[PDB]
Design a protein around this ligand. Sequence first.
Ligand SMILES: *[C@@H]1O[C@H](CO)[C@@H](O[C@@H]2O[C@H](CO)[C@@H](O[C@@H]3O[C@H](CO)[C@@H](O)[C@H](O)[C@@H]3O)[C@H](O)[C@H]2NC(C)=O)[C@H](O)[C@H]1NC(C)=O
Ligand SMILES: *[C@@H]1O[C@H](CO)[C@@H](O[C@@H]2O[C@H](CO)[C@@H](O[C@@H]3O[C@H](CO)[C@@H](O)[C@H](O)[C@@H]3O)[C@H](O)[C@H]2NC(C)=O)[C@H](O)[C@H]1NC(C)=O
Ligand SMILES: *[C@@H]1O[C@H](CO)[C@@H](O[C@@H]2O[C@H](CO)[C@@H](O[C@@H]3O[C@H](CO)[C@@H](O)[C@H](O)[C@@H]3O)[C@H](O)[C@H]2NC(C)=O)[C@H](O)[C@H]1NC(C)=O
Ligand SMILES: *[C@@H]1O[C@H](CO)[C@@H](O[C@@H]2O[C@H](CO)[C@@H](O)[C@H](O)[C@H]2NC(C)=O)[C@H](O)[C@H]1NC(C)=O
Ligand SMILES: *[C@@H]1O[C@H](CO)[C@@H](O[C@@H]2O[C@H](CO)[C@@H](O)[C@H](O)[C@H]2NC(C)=O)[C@H](O)[C@H]1NC(C)=O
Ligand SMILES: *[C@@H]1O[C@H](CO)[C@@H](O[C@@H]2O[C@H](CO)[C@@H](O)[C@H](O)[C@H]2NC(C)=O)[C@H](O)[C@H]1NC(C)=O
Ligand SMILES: *[C@@H]1O[C@H](CO)[C@@H](O)[C@H](O)[C@H]1NC(C)=O
Ligand SMILES: *[C@@H]1O[C@H](CO)[C@@H](O)[C@H](O)[C@H]1NC(C)=O
Ligand SMILES: *[C@@H]1O[C@H](CO)[C@@H](O)[C@H](O)[C@H]1NC(C)=O
Ligand SMILES: *[C@H]1O[C@H](CO)[C@@H](O)[C@H](O)[C@H]1NC(C)=O
Ligand SMILES: *[C@H]1O[C@H](CO)[C@@H](O)[C@H](O)[C@H]1NC(C)=O
Ligand SMILES: *[C@H]1O[C@H](CO)[C@@H](O)[C@H](O)[C@H]1NC(C)=O
Lengths: 172, 172, 172, 321, 321, 321
Amino acid sequence: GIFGAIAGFIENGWEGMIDGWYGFRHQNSEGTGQAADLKSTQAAIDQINGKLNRVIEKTNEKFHQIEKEFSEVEGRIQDLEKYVEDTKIDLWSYNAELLVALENQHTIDLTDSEMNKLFEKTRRQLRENAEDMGNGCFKIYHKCDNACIGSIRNGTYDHDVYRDEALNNRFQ
Amino acid sequence: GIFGAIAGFIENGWEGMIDGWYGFRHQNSEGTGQAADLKSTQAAIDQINGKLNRVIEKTNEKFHQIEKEFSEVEGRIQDLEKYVEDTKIDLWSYNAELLVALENQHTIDLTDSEMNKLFEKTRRQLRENAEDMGNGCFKIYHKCDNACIGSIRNGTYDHDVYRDEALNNRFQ
Amino acid sequence: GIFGAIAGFIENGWEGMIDGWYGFRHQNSEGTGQAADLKSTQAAIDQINGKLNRVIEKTNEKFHQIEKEFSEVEGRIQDLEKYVEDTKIDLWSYNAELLVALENQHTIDLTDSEMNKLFEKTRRQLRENAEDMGNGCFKIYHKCDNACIGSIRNGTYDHDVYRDEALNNRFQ
Amino acid sequence: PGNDNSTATLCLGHHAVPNGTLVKTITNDQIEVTNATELVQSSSTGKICNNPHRILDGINCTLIDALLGDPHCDGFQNETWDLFVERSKAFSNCYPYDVPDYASLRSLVASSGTLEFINEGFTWTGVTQNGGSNACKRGPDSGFFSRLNWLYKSGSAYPVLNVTMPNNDNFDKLYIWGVHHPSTDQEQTNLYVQASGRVTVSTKRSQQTIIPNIGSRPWVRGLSSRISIYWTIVKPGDILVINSNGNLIAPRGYFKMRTGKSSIMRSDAPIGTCISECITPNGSIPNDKPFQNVNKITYGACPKYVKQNTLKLATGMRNVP
Amino acid sequence: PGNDNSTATLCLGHHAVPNGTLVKTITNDQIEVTNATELVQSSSTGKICNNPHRILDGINCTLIDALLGDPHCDGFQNETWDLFVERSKAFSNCYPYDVPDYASLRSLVASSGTLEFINEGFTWTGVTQNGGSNACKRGPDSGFFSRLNWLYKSGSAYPVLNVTMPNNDNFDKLYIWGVHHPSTDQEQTNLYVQASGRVTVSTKRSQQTIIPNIGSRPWVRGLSSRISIYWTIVKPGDILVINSNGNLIAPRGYFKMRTGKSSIMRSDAPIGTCISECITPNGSIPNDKPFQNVNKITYGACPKYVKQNTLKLATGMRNVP
Amino acid sequence: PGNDNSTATLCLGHHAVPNGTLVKTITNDQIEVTNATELVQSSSTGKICNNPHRILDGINCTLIDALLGDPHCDGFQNETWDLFVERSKAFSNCYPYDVPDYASLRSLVASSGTLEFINEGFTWTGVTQNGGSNACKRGPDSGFFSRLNWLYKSGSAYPVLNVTMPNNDNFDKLYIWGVHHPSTDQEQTNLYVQASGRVTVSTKRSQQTIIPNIGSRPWVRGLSSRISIYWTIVKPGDILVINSNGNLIAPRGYFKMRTGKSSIMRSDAPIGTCISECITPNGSIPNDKPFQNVNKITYGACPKYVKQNTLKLATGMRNVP
Ligand SMILES: *[C@@H]1O[C@H](CO)[C@@H](O[C@@H]2O[C@H](CO)[C@@H](O[C@@H]3O[C@H](CO)[C@@H](O)[C@H](O)[C@@H]3O)[C@H](O)[C@H]2NC(C)=O)[C@H](O)[C@H]1NC(C)=O
Ligand SMILES: *[C@@H]1O[C@H](CO)[C@@H](O[C@@H]2O[C@H](CO)[C@@H](O[C@@H]3O[C@H](CO)[C@@H](O)[C@H](O)[C@@H]3O)[C@H](O)[C@H]2NC(C)=O)[C@H](O)[C@H]1NC(C)=O
Ligand SMILES: *[C@@H]1O[C@H](CO)[C@@H](O[C@@H]2O[C@H](CO)[C@@H](O[C@@H]3O[C@H](CO)[C@@H](O)[C@H](O)[C@@H]3O)[C@H](O)[C@H]2NC(C)=O)[C@H](O)[C@H]1NC(C)=O
Ligand SMILES: *[C@@H]1O[C@H](CO)[C@@H](O[C@@H]2O[C@H](CO)[C@@H](O)[C@H](O)[C@H]2NC(C)=O)[C@H](O)[C@H]1NC(C)=O
Ligand SMILES: *[C@@H]1O[C@H](CO)[C@@H](O[C@@H]2O[C@H](CO)[C@@H](O)[C@H](O)[C@H]2NC(C)=O)[C@H](O)[C@H]1NC(C)=O
Ligand SMILES: *[C@@H]1O[C@H](CO)[C@@H](O[C@@H]2O[C@H](CO)[C@@H](O)[C@H](O)[C@H]2NC(C)=O)[C@H](O)[C@H]1NC(C)=O
Ligand SMILES: *[C@@H]1O[C@H](CO)[C@@H](O)[C@H](O)[C@H]1NC(C)=O
Ligand SMILES: *[C@@H]1O[C@H](CO)[C@@H](O)[C@H](O)[C@H]1NC(C)=O
Ligand SMILES: *[C@@H]1O[C@H](CO)[C@@H](O)[C@H](O)[C@H]1NC(C)=O
Ligand SMILES: *[C@H]1O[C@H](CO)[C@@H](O)[C@H](O)[C@H]1NC(C)=O
Ligand SMILES: *[C@H]1O[C@H](CO)[C@@H](O)[C@H](O)[C@H]1NC(C)=O
Ligand SMILES: *[C@H]1O[C@H](CO)[C@@H](O)[C@H](O)[C@H]1NC(C)=O
């Protein structure tokens, strides 16, 4: 029973993030906080809406076709009509099964990817001022108040400003 | 002809690992050693068994159908019966070809991924105590006996214990 | 309007690279330069030629089939002939649509992957002598003339030679 | 309490829900995602919406009885439809008949989409017209199919009938005609004099020729006799010839043929005052989903029939506690 | 010797085998993996396993000869089957016959799955029953199809035959009957008096009516004459009427119809004492694989036919030396 | 100017073009790539290349008129083809005729691939041979279908015709024959004496038997009479028997049947002096692409027909400015 330590995406999701799909949780001098990342959130949504527009890219319109139920036994021609239709249904049933499996694999992959993409982006910002804790979190080796964390989420963090302070905490 | 140096997954597999799909080889004060990683091994196997259960997700049962060979020339109706069947076979033949290609692409991708996933996991454990040699191996910048290597494979390696010793070897 | 700074693949392509698909741009004591990387270039091309050989893996030869246009109204049999053919076309039309979408997704993925693969390869060469600037470029923390950059592109860069000089520039 | 003032922790994460749902992938058979959507339509309202397709409810009539002009189907004269609906309660109540290749005539009429009928002035020299039967009551009087003309002896003979009707129009004409099969060799002569009639109906490139067959069939509405129904389509520029020795059940004109989106469906589903593009025998179904397992029989803009009753498309990431 | 005591090397790696196998991917046409499995079944045992489907070996008999009751097929009376097997050595040895739409009768009987036959007490007033022929020997005596009744003149006439048989049962009845075509205009009168017989077989909604044709056909088992075989299905609540002037080859009763999983296959493969769900004309094949290129003709739980003779599914990682 | 002499910048990058092209993916509906290629063939040259398939241009003749031997189609005697091309301008100019199941005869002849005809020495005792008609002029003289023999009365009678022709060959023989339908009951007796002819054509296992029908049809080239065309295939070891009372339009021999790659196509496209594997009614199309939306009707090694007019396959990376 450990409350207090925050943790990242490595084998845990955040039930408490209801204003976005991806985001940051921080712990610093001023306490803790949380903020969604709209950009990666929107990127996942756009991709998923696209598949779901293409999958629903409008039905086929069919009118007069062939009969598919029969009140009389007839032999050869009816056999063929039933076989044609059974063949069509099995092939479409296969198409549907495969489509869903492929699309769901892809949905999972692209959502995982957005997550990792946001991690790497953050890591690139931090340069030598932080280390990967291994749990989806960075240890930032300098005083980083709410405004500081904000600059990271905002993409305006200047690593040079804190570099001396951080290198000193990391090593010597 | 260089025997002595060990090497990692970067463009070489280990023919000598027969108790697992993925693993560690080490070289330290006590000599060399090798140990499979069951978890990533099991993860690849589970995924592959799943595809191979879904691909073999039981045959279609068909009974009375249409005739497909003919002893007499007949024209229009036979033409149609042959065309219906030729059409079905070509479509299923296509399905099979594509399925295998897609599934094999995926099998290769997920097995490569498990490999890289185990590398990154190890890298995260090591923090600042090791460097990526570029060949799938880490240079661990501190005395790491068999028990030490064991703690890495076991996931109980404490980077803090060795941090001072390693940072000193890496830099100053 | 900033000319002078060079930049990497992070959200920008190089219109000025006409002798390869992937490559290096550098800036050093001797000025700037650019060189294609043939290996990753060839790897993308080979993969794309493969798909484009398999997609064009030769047409199906068909001869006598069924009639598909009719000058007279006939009812049941013609209905079936039209339905058989409409069914075939819709299924192949679906196959084609899906194939192209899947293949194009894959083409994009494998080309992105080659890019990132060349970045990581370079990063592994550089060890502790460089830092990721975040824009697809490395800051190399030592004097690296044209010959030096060449050794990096050539895969013969010895990180040890420059390590002391670089660690000193990076930190102390 | 509180953490050191010298460092900070910044974690990256994704949302999760307490109510995840299981979907299928290539990798795994059951993986939990944050949200998903059904791709198989498996329910119907139970009603055939009468908008936007024109639905013609056959009620007590099959399309063929509406075509021939069975008296209780008189309300269908010259009717049109996108989809004709035949009900299981439908019944025939005219001269007992059969249609060799019933299904083809039903199909081609269904697809043509109209019973628009045009009277033509056939001259029938030497025979009596408008024969009626007690098995085809039209009020209290004996009667017959509205679109058919039961010809029989006049005075005491039945001259070889022999007439023509050119198609000088721009559309195909459909002619419905018949051959009468009396039950007794004594019924045959009594109506048509000759002991073995014939009906030859021809165009320039085609001909049908039918010989009647005397004999008793099962009693239907008082009768062991039958009529067999045939049809002939006459293209623009072509000519219809009708030659008969007897037993001819003559057409009174033609049905104008069309091409288009018209069809026919067997269903007992009530007609609904509502709007739906996709129609099944179960009733109309929505078409927002790409697939459906309601019925392989459909009409209009419909999801494709599949065997699965459910297919869940992930619309969110993997759900992880 | 040995490495420094100040550092260590820890390498990550994956296994590899000396016997890799080539598979196909999207990326590459031939990539070596550590292991793979065949998805196309391309071999058969060469035997049709008689378990778990009931296999009925026709031996010298086609299903139609078993149906009609060709004497050497008498052992098939009232037989049932999941899969009837017709052999290339089969032969007919009764009255020479043809079946217009042979394939449909063969199909519907195959699918019904039984030759369960019920005798009905047809009364045939004024004619002689049980005619026999030297072309259909039944021992040393002339004989005929067991399920058919060759009617002919009695005294010196052949009165218009006219009988009925209602279906007061819950199942469909299949009636098999025939029309005799004599070879000479003198054979016709000698058997049936009338010079041009007719056979009309009818229910309430359907009728078939056949006129014989006198003339010589190729000599078969002594004969230039033929019988043509027809059928009629009578639904519950409906009635069969049979009217004939002559040349009628009468049914002796009906075959009880069923629906189910029964079929028919042409094969010369021996029947095997073994177990297999999937049957092909080559013999039974295993069904562990999703596909097969043994035969497009199959029965039971089978892999799907495809044109490829091999498809290798990777079941291991890329093999790298 | 210039950068510090203490460091260097090394950037990794990929090319981009100023003229990117949009393709479709799973992820996005329109993504710009550096280059792509069309997979749907949507154009034709407009000409049917006469290489490498043997193209036989029917010109004024349908395959059936070439088969029967309509005089203006005499140039097609014994012709062969990979693909027979029927033109919309084709016309008949012989005795007015119909073919019940025209489409099947046209199909089986098309697929057989030859009109190779062998004369057989049919003996026709007691009748007159080689009847000719003004509706089938052969020069200035009345004439008839080359492959057919119009038989009629000799002296003053028409004896029951009755002949045989065994197949002692290794191939199937196709026999084309006919039945004449006179327009008047007085035309019938005048040609054939009997008042109701018959034609029975039989092998050991099959028979067709046709009764003519007297009556007027629409005037065609002077005539209200018709001939109806039938066929019979005789397998090796089997025997053809032809029995007729009158109205027989007799074959003069058989057409040798083959199996192979031959077919027939309706097209008005000019024949081209060029080379193409794939043929459509629009003309030949290249087959470098996997798909095509030119025509669902094709012959030879062709791309598969699809509904899309364009499908762009990326052949380069994402294009980024
Ligand atoms: C769980 O996933 C489903 C997947 O579709 C989500 O349902 C969809 O939600 C969107 C947004 O509310 C709906 O789009 C909207 O449709 C209306 C209809 O006109 C339109 O006016 C709006 O502008 C917008 O495009 C969409 O229809 C709806 N789909 C279904 C099948 O209901 C759902 O939002 C997800 N749930 C959560 C909690 O995220
Ligand atoms: C090479 O790949 C094939 C891919 O299937 C592997 O073959 C499979 O091996 C497994 C494990 O031995 C078999 O599963 C077992 O089946 C029995 C049958 O009842 C069951 O009782 C066991 O509990 C287990 O589920 C599987 O049947 C077998 N598949 C085939 C087609 O033979 C094979 O192991 C791989 N080779 C190596 C060296 O890894
Ligand atoms: C844009 O993408 C298309 C995708 O195919 C590229 O077109 C292809 O270019 C290659 C190389 O020039 C062609 O291959 C060659 O074909 C000839 C034909 O015999 C052969 O002799 C050569 O050895 C080589 O294999 C290929 O045919 C051609 N495909 C098409 C459809 O034209 C094109 O190069 C790309 N454009 C750029 C600027 O990269
Ligand atoms: C729609 O109607 C069809 C039949 O018209 C229903 O399918 C039948 O379902 C019952 C009960 O499951 C089965 O006993 C029958 O065998 C089915 N018939 C056929 C032809 O498959 C179907 O269940 C109905 N669906 C809905 C949603 O009403
Ligand atoms: C199973 O039987 C079929 C035929 O019943 C075989 O297919 C034939 O194979 C031969 C030799 O390759 C060809 O000459 C024929 O053209 C094929 N016939 C057809 C209809 O395709 C098949 O090879 C047999 N397979 C096995 C495994 O026994
Ligand atoms: C090839 O020919 C076909 C017809 O033989 C053309 O298809 C027709 O196209 C016209 C104009 O678009 C339509 O009005 C017809 O309805 C189409 N007919 C059919 C049967 O679909 C086709 O456009 C031609 N294509 C080329 C490239 O010449
Ligand atoms: C349909 O027929 C029934 C009798 O079978 C009759 O009672 C009913 O009124 C008829 N419906 C209409 C609309 O005429
Ligand atoms: C099948 O017929 C042959 C003669 O053709 C006969 O010798 C054999 O005994 C028959 N088989 C059976 C089981 O009666
Ligand atoms: C085809 O027929 C027309 C008349 O319809 C004729 O003028 C033309 O010469 C004919 N073509 C050939 C090749 O005989
Ligand atoms: C139906 O339309 C035809 C075509 O004009 C017309 O002649 C006929 O009188 C109409 N009948 C009814 C009942 O409206
Ligand atoms: C076959 O079954 C029927 C139906 O009961 C029975 O009447 C008949 O006698 C049986 N015949 C044989 C040979 O078992
Ligand atoms: C066509 O071939 C047949 C078969 O040998 C031959 O008898 C006939 O004379 C040939 N006819 C022509 C016109 O070449």
